[PDB]
């Protein structure tokens, strides 16, 4: 009876973790920030509408210069946008149209995209030939590629539907480390501001804290009821934001190892496709299936505003590194830039 | 005006990119996209053999019409998370082995067919249902009764009646008989008219979509 004894001591360890979490629950976040007062109405207007995609926009990522975006639609093309001018800088034909994710390297020289082909393809935006080539096709995931995030020009973390996250050496195309431990399809990634830890959200209502260098899972964060579709780090890299199908965003803390605030509403029953924080972290922006993007007061869990204006599900959502604008992509084939 | 020379050249680049995007989208709105489904050990691989780790695309042209089939086999992940990627395919080719009624395999096929047919992303997507392995089905139906798969089956243990009973059992899983149609075919090891049946069913789908789209409904 070794297996059942292992099972019961695992349940005992989970009991100890739950007890040590509860013993740290000195006071609720909303039990503390109820005297700061409300941020106020957050009214953003659509400054830009990036037109040109002819199918559902599945992914979007800003450039670290806070001006250039990469956008992935399942019309089989990536498009780099000059958001200040709505100009298309590039248009990258994809070898597999079923793109679900896209990343912009922090240097700006590379753009990744993956999807149902199970490959993360790296594209060289800055070539001597004046086109955009495919520098690498990182194969090795046995499921669809959910999310990809560049650490630098040579490392990239990829999420996949084979329940595993991987870190890649682009120059050799090899998985330097694999992150195993999720029991459902891993759906999204969020790199910490230090690129030393990152967090995954899988279709098991769980979010895990991974170490990139040691390749181990440090903390598991539960509390959701359905698949977590979006993860985002707090600007100081000490907290989460997890969007799931059950129409709730949740704020977890790494150091307290517990959920701090839930962002739910009775008038919201549709899942969350994407979350993102503001530059200070006071606002949490969440894209929804109801075609809307609600802005949440992250300290009080009050709806601060609504980014209505997409005629289909808001599938992707990102705030610039300088906090200046928000970009929402959607299945109606448009990106819109708010301010 | 007010734009610098390099600004204007960037705008011209953006406009040429727009033109290429329009060209590509126009030629893509002319190809027929067929999601190819079915349970394991069916005749899916054989028909895709006769038609031309992740998704497998097989391109194919037949009589002034370019097709694109997407084989989502080996994509053994949660389908709830990517089945909406195929919302908008012209049709769903669903492969079923008739020789799998006694081996339940056919009930697994019917359960997978029920979820895909009633799925919320595929309310107006027709379903070209291929019933494969009919010669094996005939050489099996003499000895192994069809009632092994369907208990309440009352009828002859003959090909023309057992096959029709199976066709009806699959077609009555359609809860959207107003919105989509199921086109059933009986293929075999060497049936060379499968591409023609697909072409006919797809022309019907295209005509009825243009009817619903031109407003006639």
């Amino acid at each position, epitope marked *: 009876s070794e297996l059942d004894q292992l099972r019961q001591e695992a349940e005992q360890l989970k009991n100890q973790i739950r007890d040590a979490r509860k013993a740290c629950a000195d006071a609720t976040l909303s039990q503390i920030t109820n005297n700061i007062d409300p941020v106020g109405r957050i009214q953003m207007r659509t400054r830009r509408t990036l037109r040109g995609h002819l199918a559902k926009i599945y992914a979007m990522h800003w450039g670290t210069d806070s*001006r*250039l975006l990469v956008s992935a639609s399942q019309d089989g093309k990536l498009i780099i946008w*000059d958001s200040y*001018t709505t*100009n298309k*800088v*590039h248009a990258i034909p994809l070898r597999s149209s079923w793109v679900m994710t896209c990343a912009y390297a922090p240097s*700006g020289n590379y753009v990744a995209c993956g999807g149902l082909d199970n490959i993360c393809s790296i594209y060289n935006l800055k070539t*001597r*030939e*004046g*086109n955009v080539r495919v520098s690498r096709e990182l194969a090795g995931h046995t499921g669809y590629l959910s999310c990809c995030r560049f650490l630098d020009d040579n490392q990239i973390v990829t999420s996949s539907g084979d329940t595993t996250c991987a870190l890649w050496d682009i120059e050799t195309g090899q998985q330097t480390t694999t992150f195993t431990g999720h029991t459902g399809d891993v759906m999204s990634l969020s790199l910490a501001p230090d690129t030393r830890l990152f967090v995954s959200g899988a279709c098991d209502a769980s979010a895990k804290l991974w170490d990139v260098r040691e390749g181990m899972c440090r903390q598991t964060f539960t509390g959701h009821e359905s698949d977590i579709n979006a993860i985002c780090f707090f600007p100081n890299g000490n907290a989460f934001a997890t969007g799931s199908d059950d129409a709730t965003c949740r704020l977890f803390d790494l150091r307290a190892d517990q959920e701090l605030m839930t962002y739910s509403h009775d008038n919201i029953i549709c899942g969350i496709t994407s979350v993102s924080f503001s530059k200070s972290g006071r606002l949490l922006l969440a894209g929804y299936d109801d075609f809307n993007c609600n802005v949440w007061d992250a300290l009080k869990a009050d709806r601060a505003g609504v980014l209505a204006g997409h005629d289909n599900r808001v599938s992707c959502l990102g705030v610039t590194d300088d906090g200046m604008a928000v970009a929402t992509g959607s299945w109606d084939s448009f990106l819109k830039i708010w301010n | 005006c*007010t734009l*610098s*020379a*390099e*600004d*204007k*050249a*960037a705008v*011209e*680049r953006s406009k*040429m990119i727009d033109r290429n995007l329009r060209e590509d989208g126009e030629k893509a709105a002319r190809e027929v996209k067929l999601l190819l489904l079915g349970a394991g050990e069916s005749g899916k691989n054989t028909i895709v053999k006769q038609m031309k780790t992740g998704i497998v695309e097989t391109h194919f042209t037949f009589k002034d019409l370019h097709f694109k089939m997407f084989d989502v086999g080996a994509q053994r992940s949660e389908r709830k998370k990517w089945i909406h990627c195929f919302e908008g395919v012209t049709a769903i080719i669903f492969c079923v082995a008739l020789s799998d009624y006694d081996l339940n395999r056919m009930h697994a096929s019917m359960k997978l067919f029920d979820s895909i047919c009633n799925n919320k992303w595929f309310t107006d997507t027709s379903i070209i249902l291929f019933l494969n392995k009919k010669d094996l089905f005939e050489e099996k139906i003499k000895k192994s009764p069809l009632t092994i798969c369907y208990p309440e089956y009352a009828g002859s243990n003959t090909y023309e009646e057992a096959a029709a009973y199976i066709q009806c059992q699959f077609e009555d899983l359609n809860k959207r008989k107003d919105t989509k149609e199921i086109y059933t075919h009986f293929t075999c090891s060497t049936d060379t008219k499968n591409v023609q049946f697909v072409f006919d069913a797809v022309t019907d789908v295209i005509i009825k979509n243009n009817l619903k789209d031109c407003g006639l409904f």
Partner: single-chain antibody
Amino acid sequence: VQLVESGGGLVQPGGSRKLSCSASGFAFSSFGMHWVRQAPEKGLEWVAYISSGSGTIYYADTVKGRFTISRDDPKNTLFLQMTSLRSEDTAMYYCVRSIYYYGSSPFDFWGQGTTLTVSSDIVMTQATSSVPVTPGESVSISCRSSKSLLHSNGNTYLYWFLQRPGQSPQLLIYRMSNLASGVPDRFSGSGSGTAFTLTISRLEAEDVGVYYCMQHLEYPLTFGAGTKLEL
């Protein structure tokens, strides 16, 4: 990446000749191509331009109505049908590769040049004509303009080119501060809109050449006189 120019040689005055330009090693359809000539021992002089897609074409006032620039992308070749050739057209015609998007590096590659021998613009001023320099020391090549190249969009369209004694001009710095690809970080760019400076921190024997000062704010694109660095 290569541009090979063909079609030079001794021409009668008033005749007509066509310069070809066989491109190689890059997406020739995606670049705007220029023609830049250089009188026997004088400075650079912009001649024509044809955009990517052949949609936009510009000429210098000297060659308007006489020179015709063409683009034949399927053969990756650029043309310049010259007519009514005067002795002022005796020069060295370079094809220049130029691509324009947000953050690009236009004029990054120059051809090798074909020698043709006939028997309200922005004035860029390089008040210095030559500087005797010493390897290892700092050298500042200054440029000036009659109009402020600082645009309303924040870009200062100033370009620095270096032409080593027996070669074609090479882009050093684009938009007044941005170091081109393949050029070492010794070269630095700064300016104020009407006054510009090219700084070379420590000199090597290969930095010896003529440093040209082009503007890209308005057409015609105008070069400086050319500041020579000699040992």
